[PDB]
Copies of this chain bind each other. A is one copy, B any other.
Amino acid sequence: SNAMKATRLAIPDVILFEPRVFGDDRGFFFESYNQRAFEEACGHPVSFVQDNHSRSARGVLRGLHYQIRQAQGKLVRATLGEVFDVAVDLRRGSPTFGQWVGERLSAENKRQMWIPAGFAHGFVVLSEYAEFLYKTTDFWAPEHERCIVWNDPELKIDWPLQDAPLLSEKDRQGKAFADADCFP
């Protein structure tokens, strides 16, 4: 809280974090995670069992991914370059079921998004390259991973792209939101 600012997004359980920076670009220090500030913001204890690090080229779009079994919360940020990061609410009975929020996360702005279990997640690289880090509350389970296609016409996500994104074949084959199984 002295370590950073937290802002609830339009889906209020999705939280945008922004660490306080001590120093400048010739030399700085910041807390990228503080369990006390985090658990204050989301309102419950959280354990992170797996951290991931990816590198992707401009226009690469990964998502929209979720797993129903071993449901994962994800705390995500960019340590190189810039992405547009999206969370989609897939929780049964949520008053924001089927809505999305998106934010630009970059190495410069140091912003982070907390995406609770029960959401789908995706991002697109806006810079020449982006390196993307995330802490997750359960282990990735490829046999349980589901996908909703990035350009679903009901979700109507406003991806800040001019050129068509670069997708894996699996993400190109993502389900329509109408057809997607969701969280109990």
Q: Hey, which bits of chain A sit against chain B, CB under 8 A?
A: 19, 23, 25-36, 47-57, 60, 79-80, 131, 133, 135, 139
Contact = CB atoms under 8 A, between A and B. Distances in A.
A55 B32 contact: no
Contact of A50 (B27, B34, B48, B53): B34
A172 B29 CA distance: 19
Is chain A's interface secondary structure helix, strand, loop, or mixed overall?
Answer: strand
A56 B27 contact: yes
Contact of A57 (B27, B33, B55, B57): B27
B47 A31 contact: no
B29 A53 contact: yes
A52 B30 CA distance: 6
A163 B26 CA distance: 19
A28 B55 contact: yes
17 contacts: A26-B57, A27-B57, A29-B52, A29-B53, A29-B54, A30-B52, A30-B53, A30-B54, A31-B51, A32-B53, A33-B50, A34-B49, A35-B50, A36-B49, A36-B139, A53-B79, A79-B131
Nearest to A77: B53
